[PDB]
Design an enzyme around this catalytic site. Structure first.
Site, short mmCIF file in Angstrom:
data_model
loop_
_atom_site.label_atom_id
_atom_site.label_comp_id
_atom_site.label_asym_id
_atom_site.label_seq_id
_atom_site.Cartn_x
_atom_site.Cartn_y
_atom_site.Cartn_z
N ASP A 141 -5.12 16.65 -4.52
CA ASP A 141 -5.56 16.58 -3.12
C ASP A 141 -4.97 17.70 -2.26
O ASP A 141 -4.46 17.47 -1.17
CB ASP A 141 -5.31 15.18 -2.49
CG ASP A 141 -6.05 14.86 -1.18
OD1 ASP A 141 -6.83 15.73 -0.69
OD2 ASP A 141 -5.81 13.77 -0.62
N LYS B 96 9.97 6.46 5.25
CA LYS B 96 8.72 5.75 5.05
C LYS B 96 9.01 4.41 4.39
O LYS B 96 9.71 4.36 3.38
CB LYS B 96 7.74 6.60 4.21
CG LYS B 96 6.36 5.97 4.03
CD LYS B 96 5.45 6.84 3.18
CE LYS B 96 4.07 6.23 3.03
NZ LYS B 96 3.10 7.19 2.43
N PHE C 292 0.95 9.38 10.92
CA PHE C 292 1.42 9.35 9.54
C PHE C 292 1.83 7.93 9.10
O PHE C 292 2.45 7.75 8.05
CB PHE C 292 2.58 10.35 9.34
CG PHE C 292 2.21 11.80 9.53
CD1 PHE C 292 1.75 12.56 8.46
CD2 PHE C 292 2.33 12.41 10.77
CE1 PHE C 292 1.42 13.91 8.63
CE2 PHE C 292 1.99 13.75 10.94
CZ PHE C 292 1.55 14.49 9.87
N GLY C 293 1.42 6.94 9.89
CA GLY C 293 1.73 5.54 9.63
C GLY C 293 3.13 5.16 10.07
O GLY C 293 3.61 5.65 11.09
N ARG D 38 -4.12 20.05 5.60
CA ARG D 38 -3.56 18.84 6.23
C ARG D 38 -2.42 18.23 5.38
O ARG D 38 -1.64 17.42 5.88
CB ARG D 38 -4.66 17.76 6.43
CG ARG D 38 -5.22 17.18 5.11
CD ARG D 38 -6.36 16.18 5.24
NE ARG D 38 -6.98 15.92 3.93
CZ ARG D 38 -8.02 16.59 3.43
NH1 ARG D 38 -8.60 17.56 4.13
NH2 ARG D 38 -8.47 16.31 2.22
N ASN D 39 -2.37 18.57 4.08
CA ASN D 39 -1.43 18.02 3.11
C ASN D 39 -0.25 18.92 2.83
O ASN D 39 0.51 18.64 1.92
CB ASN D 39 -2.18 17.64 1.84
CG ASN D 39 -3.11 16.45 2.06
OD1 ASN D 39 -2.87 15.56 2.89
ND2 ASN D 39 -4.21 16.42 1.34
N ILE E 47 7.75 8.95 13.95
CA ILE E 47 7.52 10.37 13.90
C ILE E 47 5.99 10.58 13.97
O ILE E 47 5.24 9.85 13.33
CB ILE E 47 8.15 10.93 12.58
CG1 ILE E 47 9.69 11.04 12.70
CG2 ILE E 47 7.55 12.24 12.19
CD1 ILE E 47 10.42 11.42 11.40
N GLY E 48 5.56 11.55 14.76
CA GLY E 48 4.16 11.96 14.90
C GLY E 48 3.17 10.97 15.48
O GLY E 48 2.04 10.88 14.99
N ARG E 49 3.56 10.24 16.54
CA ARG E 49 2.74 9.30 17.32
C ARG E 49 1.82 8.36 16.48
O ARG E 49 0.68 8.07 16.87
CB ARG E 49 1.92 10.09 18.36
CG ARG E 49 2.74 10.55 19.58
CD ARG E 49 3.25 11.97 19.44
NE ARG E 49 4.39 12.23 20.33
CZ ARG E 49 5.66 12.15 19.96
NH1 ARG E 49 5.99 11.80 18.72
NH2 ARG E 49 6.63 12.41 20.84
F1 LIG Z 1 4.06 13.77 2.30
C1 LIG Z 1 4.39 12.86 3.27
C2 LIG Z 1 4.52 11.54 2.92
C3 LIG Z 1 4.85 10.64 3.92
C4 LIG Z 1 5.04 11.08 5.22
C5 LIG Z 1 4.90 12.42 5.55
C6 LIG Z 1 5.10 12.90 6.96
C7 LIG Z 1 6.42 13.59 7.21
C8 LIG Z 1 7.49 13.74 6.37
N1 LIG Z 1 8.49 14.44 7.00
C9 LIG Z 1 8.08 14.72 8.28
N2 LIG Z 1 8.80 15.36 9.20
C10 LIG Z 1 8.17 15.53 10.38
C11 LIG Z 1 6.88 15.08 10.67
C12 LIG Z 1 6.24 15.37 11.96
C13 LIG Z 1 5.05 14.86 12.48
N3 LIG Z 1 4.75 15.38 13.66
N4 LIG Z 1 5.76 16.26 13.90
C14 LIG Z 1 5.82 17.08 15.13
C15 LIG Z 1 4.75 18.16 15.09
C16 LIG Z 1 4.80 19.01 16.35
N5 LIG Z 1 4.67 18.15 17.56
C17 LIG Z 1 5.75 17.13 17.63
C18 LIG Z 1 5.73 16.24 16.40
C19 LIG Z 1 6.66 16.29 12.90
C20 LIG Z 1 6.17 14.41 9.67
C21 LIG Z 1 6.79 14.22 8.44
C22 LIG Z 1 4.57 13.33 4.55
#
Ligand SMILES: Fc1cccc(Cc2c[nH]c3ncc(-c4cnn(C5CCNCC5)c4)cc23)c1
Length: 279
Positions: free
Chosen positions: A147, A56, A35-36, A151-152, A30-32
């Site tokens: 934090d 995760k 987000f690791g 972004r969070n 998820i997200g290229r």
């Molecule tokens: F507090 C955390 C702790 C760990 C991880 C995370 C990350 C996380 C959780 N649930 C998500 N669900 C979707 C996406 C995501 C990323 N990018 N996108 C789209 C955006 C538009 N363009 C397409 C991709 C969706 C990211 C997360 C958070």
């Protein structure tokens, strides 16, 4: 896994997702990678409803001592539930897994920065009120975030903001390589390294500023080392171009040097909903 205390295993049972309830898609991130190692997953509820989730893999946990500790942070985060706070769907016991809801529009900062999106001043204030509602809930539980920043926070398919990056959802931006958020911190946190709900209120002030500038970086001309002296001189972030005067009054109150003089999150919800209602 057999080596874990039975009374603790009994205590974490309500947080555990069995392997027959979850389909993890380890072949799709998820997200290229931003987000690791976060993967798409499908969670099955008691009635067999399919739930799109984000999975995760918690690579930092190795020994039984660490597993036991993470099991506790799971029990605590599972009791936190609010429409403006990112929920913990559960955990899986290689590496332990953390299961979170899928957020269609990713992080709030990237969403507001994206040239193709055009939220109104009202919409931006609405996002701020949502964050204030999530923080009012965390503050009510005596939980200090430490934090808070745009972004969070995450955005779902209904454009509901969820405060994230806390508990088991922390280190949301931990990227792997092969080879302190001082600009959001309260003046006293920069001087003492201590955090309180009143220092989250200061951070909320900066996030409000981030929303009203569509994700501009705060104090771009000031070094992280120089932030303390800058704040001690009484200098603050300036009123954004498209920001109502009563809303900037709110931001300024968040940045008052005396922690007790800052509004509570319940006051911020009251004051921002009143401003939101004038649009
Ligand atoms: F507090 C955390 C702790 C760990 C991880 C995370 C990350 C996380 C959780 N649930 C998500 N669900 C979707 C996406 C995501 C990323 N990018 N996108 C789209 C955006 C538009 N363009 C397409 C991709 C969706 C990211 C997360 C958070």
């Amino acid at each position: 896994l057999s080596a874990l205390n039975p009374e603790l295993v009994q205590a974490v049972q309500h947080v555990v997702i069995g392997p027959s309830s979850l389909i993890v898609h380890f072949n799709e991130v998820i997200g290229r990678g931003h987000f690791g190692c976060v993967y798409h997953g499908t969670l099955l509820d008691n009635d067999g409803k399919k739930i799109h989730c984000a999975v995760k893999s918690l690579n930092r946990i190795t020994d039984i001592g660490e597993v036991s500790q993470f099991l506790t942070e799971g029990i605590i985060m599972k009791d936190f539930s609010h429409p403006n706070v990112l929920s913990l769907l559960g955990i899986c016991l290689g590496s332990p897994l953390v299961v979170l809801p899928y957020m269609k529009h990713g992080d709030l900062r990237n969403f507001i920065r994206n040239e193709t999106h055009n939220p109104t001043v009202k919409d931006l204030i609405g996002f701020g009120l949502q964050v204030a509602k999530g923080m009012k809930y965390l503050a009510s539980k005596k939980f200090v975030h430490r934090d808070l920043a745009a972004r969070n926070c995450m955005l779902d398919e209904k454009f509901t903001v969820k405060v994230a990056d806390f508990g088991l959802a922390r280190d949301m931006y931990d990227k792997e390589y092969y080879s302190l958020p001082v600009k959001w911190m309260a003046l006293e946190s920069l001087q003492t390294q201590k955090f309180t709900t009143k220092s989250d209120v200061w951070s909320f002030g900066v996030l409000l500023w981030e929303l009203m500038t569509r994700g501009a970086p705060p104090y771009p001309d000031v070094n992280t080392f120089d932030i303390t002296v800058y704040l001690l001189q009484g200098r603050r972030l300036l009123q954004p171009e498209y920001c109502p005067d009563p809303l900037y009054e709110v931001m300024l109150k968040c940045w008052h040097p005396k922690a007790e003089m800052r509004p509570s999150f319940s006051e911020l919800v009251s004051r921002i909903s009143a401003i939101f209602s004038t649009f």
